[PDB]
């Protein structure tokens, strides 16, 4: 099934908690995708515009600094935060679709993970 916060109270609570956490650290949900994790995220980030990727790096650095200092974003910017305003899922889906097509008919992987 597909459970969205409009048709599920539990999903509404889950989304509320995720929004609260991400707003506390001031970073979008897409910023949690590690380029070293999948290597499809690496390609999707390689294809995105430099302004967007630089904003992602700045938000991540701010979050890491706040984590070290053991504090949260001040309430002003916390109210100014916009989590779940995605910038990466469409490109990641395109990359994965292209990889699936290439794998499906002949083709060698365009990139591979080292061992390990």
């Amino acid at each position: 099934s597909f459970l969205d916060p409009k048709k599920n109270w539990l999903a509404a609570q889950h989304m509320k908690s995720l929004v609260k956490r991400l707003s506390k650290y001031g970073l979008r949900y897409d910023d949690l995708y590690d380029p070293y994790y999948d290597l499809d995220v690496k390609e999707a980030l390689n294809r995105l515009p430099k302004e967007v990727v630089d904003a992602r790096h700045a938000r991540l650095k701010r979050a890491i600094d706040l984590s070290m200092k053991h504090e949260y974003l001040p309430e002003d910017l916390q109210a100014m935060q916009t989590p779940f305003r995605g910038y990466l899922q469409d490109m990641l889906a395109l990359v994965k679709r292209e990889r699936a097509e290439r794998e499906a008919l002949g083709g060698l992987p365009l990139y591979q993970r080292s061992i390990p």
């Binding site: 001031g26 904003a55 938000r59 650095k61 600094d65 910017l77 100014m80 916009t82």
Partner: peptide, 13 residues
């Protein structure tokens, strides 16, 4: 030194 620095990042949201 680190736990009391102020960094300006040119990003808001």
């Amino acid at each position: 030194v680190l736990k009391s620095r102020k960094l300006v990042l040119d990003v808001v949201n």
